[model samples]
Every structure is written in structure tokens, then in C-alpha cells.
Target chain A: MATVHKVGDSTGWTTLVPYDYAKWASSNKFHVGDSLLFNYNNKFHNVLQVDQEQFKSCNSSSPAASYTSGADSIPLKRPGTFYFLCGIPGHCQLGQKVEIKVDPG
Target chain B: MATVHKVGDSTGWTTLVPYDYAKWASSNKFHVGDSLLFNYNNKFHNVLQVDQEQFKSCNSSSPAASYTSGADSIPLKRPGTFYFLCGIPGHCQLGQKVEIKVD
Candidate 1:
């Protein structure tokens, strides 16, 4: 129930540290009552949930849900694996996708 | 001196064809009396000219000049080499830098 996370490239994206989606998720395990926090410092980024077909196209027309730049708090309401990705054009394909698993425990 | 060039990534960046800076520059050389045109379609990108030190830090404080998202036309007034890069945050380090020679 207590987790803090940072969501920008360590050396700032300008330094080319690259965005670390895995490190952020690995530091925290989401539970049914837990919330995931996203802190953004980079210029452009967005979050979205979509199916494989939609993901491939990086479509925003009908995402399961979407979040824009800035801090976002999403509660783990379900017990399953949820796929999240940057909705910005070419961002998701640039390895901006992540999956979070929520457990009922 | 007629040249038509496209700047967006083919299939779009989302499809991951990758931005082709070489193709764009090669298609149109900037002569002493010519103007280079840039076309943009994707989101969040800028251009700037800086030295190696500035380039490494992706600095924009004192760029030779800077250009933001959208098309830009730069006249070739000097004969030498010019360095250009996307100044939007991590874009430069993401391989958004290119060198142009006016000869």
C-alpha cells in the first residue's frame, strides 16, 4: 500500500539514459488495494491500455483507458496482468510498453 | 533548384520505419543560393545547431539557431559544415542529429 516511483529517464532523456519502464515496475508490486504512481519529467509521454492489434497500430481512438503527462495514480482494481504503454506516436514501439500484475492477496 | 522532400517516418514513426535524416538531406543539397525545407508530421520535435560540447548535453541555451516543430527553411549562406539536431528533450541522443555540408 506504500510505494513511490519516478517516471523519467535518470539522466534526463537528453543524456540518453533511456526511459526505464522495467526498473520502475520491478520496484513495486501492485496489489488489489495498492496504487501505482507515475511521475513524469520528460517532454512528451502518455499511458494507455490496448489490445495486441491496437498496440501494433499505436491507436488512441479507443484505448481501454488513457493518461496524459504528469503524475497519475491508478488503483489496482483487478487481479490480472494489465498492459500499459506510452500512447504518443512511436513512443510505445520505442519500447515504452509495460505490464503490471495485480494480485488479490 | 526544385526539390520536394518528405520528413516524417514512413509508415509513420508508430510503425517504426525510423526517421530518415540522411534521405531528406541527400535528396536536397543546400547550395549557396538554395533553401532547405523541412516537413514534419509526427509530434514533439525541434532542430538546433551546436558544437560537440553543446551537442552532448543537448543544450539549447546558445545554439547557432533553433527551429521548432513544423517545417523550416534555412538558407545556405556559408560554405562549410553545419550540425543539426532535434532539441526536444531526449530526441538528439535518440539519433536525431545530422550533419550537413554546404559545398
Candidate 2:
């Protein structure tokens, strides 16, 4: 069985949104096959899976994957730390990024 | 006495926040001396009072006034249209702007 973690809880993904994603990730217990649902406004934000370097840089020029549905469901098929951020012009820098580490099932 | 209208109601002033400011302004009766309270995350956003040109341009380099307390209260002193926007980079263009016409 897989779990679906709603990133940022009720706040969802937004630039001016009040959310502490680091604490959210630490509080949850993610496992392989789980999924993450990022809810946001498509016109303003999008989900981008990026490497650690890219995440730190707040750059999405070459993201591993991209989700723009506004309500994207990302699968965690592997057991590793995953970095996600908004690829908007200045969203990531404004704290629109999250790091989730998955455990083996 | 003037009314204090909370901008965007419970949602506050946020980029991804779902709010129709035009409808919100229309639904209320704004008069001279009324105040608007813009609530938002101060770290990521700020309130900027600007003219119609600046509002449409989404530029805050020369805002009439600026508020960064996150819970900013702007008074509608004049009986005319007032424009406000987030001074953050790219925030205004991303729908972090509002216009209220005072009666």
C-alpha cells in the first residue's frame, strides 16, 4: 500500500503561502510507492523535481520532471531524498521548495 | 465613521490565493476615510500603494507608499480609485495586485 502526502497540508503550494515544508517533511513517514500531491494555482506555480544542486540554486532550467496540472500527484517509486520546487521566475527563491526522504518498503 | 474592509477576506493577499478583488471591491461600499487591511506573509510580500499606471505596469520602483508589516492598513483618504500591489519581484504580475474605487 502507498500513502499520499498532501504537501504543505491545507496551505498547498504558493509563493506568499505560510508553510514550513522542512518540518512537514520531517513529521511525515514516506515510503517507496507513496505519492505527493502538490496543490497550487497553475497560472502562477508549477511543480518541478530537481536535483539537490538545482534545488539549492532555485533553478529549474533542467528539472528531472515537471508537473503543471496545479493538482499534481507525484509518485515516489524510489527510496531516496526527493527535491521539489516551483519553477516560476522567483517562486523557489521565495520558499516554494520541499525535500522529502522516502524509506524502503 | 468608515468601515474597515479586510482585503480578500480570510484568504488575505497572496499570490496563489484564490480571490477576486474586483468582485470583493464591488460588493462593498467603500467611502472616503475607509481603511483596507492587507494581510499576508511579510517575508515574501509587501503592500505598495501606486497609481493606475504603476498598478498596470506592475512596477513598484516609485510607489506612493510602502508597507512591509504583513498586516498593513491603508486608508482611503481620497474619494477616487486606489491601487495596491505586492512589491516583491514578479509578485504583482502574478496576480498579487488589487484595485478599489472609493465612492
Candidate 3:
């Protein structure tokens, strides 16, 4: 079966979240075929992929392109530093982020 | 002589600013007893010191204790991470921040 990680497994995504996402993501195995299925609170959060420059700043002059649908499946179709975060104000800055790497699996 | 470095020398602090502060700070030597002179427009910005937790999340329940004067000198009293940033909305989040580690 193709591996799929239900993002935040059980916790889902929302505001004022106390989860240590970095610590959590560190323990998972992400392969080339793995899928990241995100389930979040549509009222308070969204997902986005940005560059190191944009990530560090938390605000972007770039267009706010992201995922708002409560259920979104992201195919791990590439291999590199996949930096994901919440585009909402103070969301990523306050501890909403995921930095993971993928290998040939 | 105790050295003093001007923050964002010449550029002064302002909006829509384009500067790689990390790169700028990396090139300088920040020693104990030194001072930093910050000059900026008060209407558009303010300075603040926050923990890594709060810094990453720009909005703090914290009442925002910060410096707004056009010119403020920060004395380096000890050695550690002296994280400084603008408290104004979208300013720090955009690019106004200084994460300085003093020795």
C-alpha cells in the first residue's frame, strides 16, 4: 500500500496549537511515494510552501497561494528541502511549520 | 575603547527596506560592553526583544514593551542571544529584524 501520513494525525490543524511540529515531523519516514494528507480547520488555518527568504520573514510580498480545503492530499513527488507552513498571520511565526527531506524509497 | 556599531548604518530604519540583516550582523564583531545605536521612524516601527517562541509568532499576548524613539542605544550588558525586531505589523514579518549573538 502507498504510504500516506495524515498530517497532524488525529490532532488536525487549528489555531493556538501546542504541537511541536518540528519534533513530530522528525520522527516520521517520508519516501518519494508517500502522501501528506492535510486535515485542518478551514476557519483558522491554511498550508503553503515558501522559500527560505519568505519562510524566515513569515510575511511575503509574494501572492498568498496555499491550501484552504480541510482535506488536501499532497504527493511527495520531489526530493529536497520541502518547507511547509501555515500562511496565516502569526501562525508560522508562532510554531506552525514542517521541514522534511525525502529519499528514494 | 568600547566599540559601538550603528544598527543598519546609513540606511537608518524604514519600511520596504531591503537589507540582509543576518548577513550584515555576521560581518561585525559584537563584544560585551559595546552599544548599538538604532535610528528609525517611530510612526512606522518600534523595537522589541522576545523569546524564540514569540519571535517566530509575531503576535504576542504580551503588551509589546518596545522602543519607539527615533534613536536608541542598546548597551550590551552580557553575553547571549539579543534578539531585536520591529513590533509594527508586517514590518518585522516582512524583513525588519536583528538576531544578534553577543560574546
Best of the candidates, DockQ: 3
Runs in model 2 deviating more than 4 A are A1-105
Instruction: Please give me the DockQ of candidate 2 compared with the native complex.
Output: 0.02
- Model 1: CA > 4 A from native: A1-45, A48-105, B1-16, B41-43, B56-58
Which scores higher on DockQ, 2 or 3? 3
Q: Candidate 3 on A33-101: residue-level lDDT in tens?
A: 788877887778778755566667765333223567878787787666566788877887787777667
Q: Kindly list the per-residue Cα lDDT of model 1 for residues A1-105, writing each as its tens digit.
A: 444333442422121235666665665666676666665543576676654556566554445556665577766766777666776676666767766667735
Give the winner by lDDT.
Answer: 2
**Displacement of the residue B92 alpha carbon in candidate 3, Å:** 1.0
lDDT of 3 at B87: 68
- Tally clashes: model 3: 3
Task: Write candidate 3's Cα lDDT for B11-89 as tens digits.
Answer: 7665433677777788779989998887886655677877767777765346345777878888888999777777665
For candidate 1 chain B, the 10 contiguous residues with the lowest summed lDDT are B8-17
Candidate 2's C-alpha lDDT? Answer: 0.84
Regions of candidate 3 where Cα sits further than 4 Å from its true position: A1-105, B60-64
Better-scoring candidate (lDDT), 1 or 2: 2
The residue-level lDDT of candidate 3 at B32 comes to 91
